[PDB]
Structures are given as C-alpha cells and as structure tokens.
C-alpha cells in the first residue's frame, strides 16, 4: 500500500519569556520516528522509533544542524508577520507548517505538499502542480511574490522528488518489521443504562495497526451512522491504536444491534453484539 513521510513544525513566541519555542516532529505513516524540541537542555534531533538505531552518528548531527537553522528562520518570520498584520510585540503568536511526500506500493511519488498557517489560520500553500503557491490573504500575497522571485517552489519540488522519496524508501526498508506489520483489532461491547428505558451500546476496537479502521452499528442490515457517536482514532502508547463508536437503543432490544469492524488485519470483518 501507499506510505508517507511527514514533518510537523511549530514556532511559538512568548514575549517577556525569552526565545520562541520551536519543535519539529516527524512521522512515517502514523508512527512518530524523530523529534526536535528547543526546550530540552541540549536540543538535538532524537530517534523516536527503535529502527532508527540503524542510522549513524552523522545522520543525527546533520538533522540537528538543520533544525537549529530552521529555528532561526521561524524566529525571524514571527517578527515579519507582526509587521504584515500591524500587531504589537506583546502577544504570543504561532506559525505551523506541514511538509510531506507520499509514495505508492512501488515506491514512486504520488503527491507532495507544504502548507503554512499563522495563529491557526491558512496562510500560504503549495499547489498540487508543485510549481505555484496560493495565498489566503494580502499578507501571504507579499510572501508569494517574494517566493516567486526567489524560486522557492523549484527548490522544494527538488526535495520532494529526490530526497523525500529516497529517504522514505530507506525508512520502510530499515523498519520493515515495524512499519509493514499488521496487528489485528480485538473488539468487545460495553453496556450502560440511561434515563428513559434506553441503553448505550459501545463498541471498542483495540490493539491494531495501521490506524485506518471503520466501525459501524447496524439495525436490520442498515447502518446507523447518523445517531452514532464516536471518537477519532487514537494512539495507545505502544505503537498501536484504538477507537470506539456508540449508539443509543431501546431497553430489551439490544440483541438486534450489531457492531461491524473492518480493518487490514481482518480477512473477514468482525461482527459482534452485547
């Protein structure tokens, strides 16, 4: 199947408390594998997955130097934006960036992207063509004009088609035992009483990988996606994921409702009831 390499970057100013906090977190698919945090006492890029023990000391030195350079560029960006938006230097502001590439089962590039936000709002983003940028407001238009004269998109496109894809392939090879594995979900149903002769039925799916999964509740062969409540799929602390979905039904009729679980690790979907 397809795989992705993504880097989430965040810069947060804190007037009166020193330099901005800067963080970088990298993921291969939905597994955290590297991290940089300016608030550690010896900021260094560090491994977050066991298989990264396969990289040599030079890899860590290079990533650390890049992170320190990035930290300085975003510090400048925070000041620049105060100017574009005519804001004071007394408040805290945030810049966020998501960069990544995705390849197919054969390892060839499917798509690439880079999007920026300021104070939680779209700022500027690379178009699908990997050649031009699209700006959300007049401040980002100034940035767009600067980047067009500097050839920023061409440099990023080179990273996507070369570096990004080549290293993603390497990580999938080195960490194959972890990244290409499949852990099957184990499910169960809990029961809770409520006011007005009704009951809450909650379907749980535990210990699975990859994260993509589908949980549904059915009544007479029909899905109840509407009156159903749920939580976003979440990490469970050991590299696996979990999720739950519930529905409210009449007391004494619980046996007519069934939970269905679909996942890569389930040759045949699971069907269960209270």
């Amino acid at each position: 199947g397809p795989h992705s390499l993504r880097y989430f970057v965040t810069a947060v100013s804190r007037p009166g408390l020193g330099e901005p906090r800067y963080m970088e977190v990298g993921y291969v698919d939905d597994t955290e594998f590297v991290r940089f945090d300016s608030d550690a006492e010896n900021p260094r890029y560090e491994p977050r997955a066991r298989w990264m023990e396969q990289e040599g000391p030079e890899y860590w030195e290079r990533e650390t130097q890049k992170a320190k350079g990035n930290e300085q560029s975003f510090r400048v960006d925070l000041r620049t934006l105060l100017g574009y938006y005519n804001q004071s230097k007394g408040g805290s502001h945030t810049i966020q960036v998501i960069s990544g590439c995705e390849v197919g089962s054969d390892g060839r590039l499917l798509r690439g992207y880079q999007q920026y936000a300021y104070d939680g709002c779209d700022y500027i983003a690379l178009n699908e063509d990997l050649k031009t940028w699209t700006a959300a407001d007049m401040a980002a238009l100034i940035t767009k004009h600067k980047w067009e004269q500097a050839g920023a998109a061409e440099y990023y496109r080179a990273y996507l088609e070369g570096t990004c894809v080549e290293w993603l392939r390497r990580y999938l090879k080195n960490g194959n035992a972890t990244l290409l594995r499949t852990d099957s979900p184990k499910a169960h149903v809990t029961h809770h009483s409520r006011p007005e002769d009704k009951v809450t039925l909650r379907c749980w799916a535990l210990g699975f990988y990859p994260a993509d999964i589908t949980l549904t509740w059915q009544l007479n062969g029909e899905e109840l996606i509407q009156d159903m409540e749920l939580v976003e799929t979440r990490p469970a602390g050991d590299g696996t994921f979990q999720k739950w979905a519930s529905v409210v039904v009449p007391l004494g009729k619980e046996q007519y409702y069934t939970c269905h679980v679909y996942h890569q690790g389930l040759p045949e979907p699971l069907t269960l009831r209270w």
Partner: peptide
C-alpha cells in the same frame, strides 16, 4: 530526512 531551508515569509 527533514526539509532543509524554509524560505523566510
């Protein structure tokens, strides 16, 4: 391998 040079805004 992380992006190397984020252009200034």
């Amino acid at each position: 391998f992380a992006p190397g040079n984020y252009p200034a805004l």
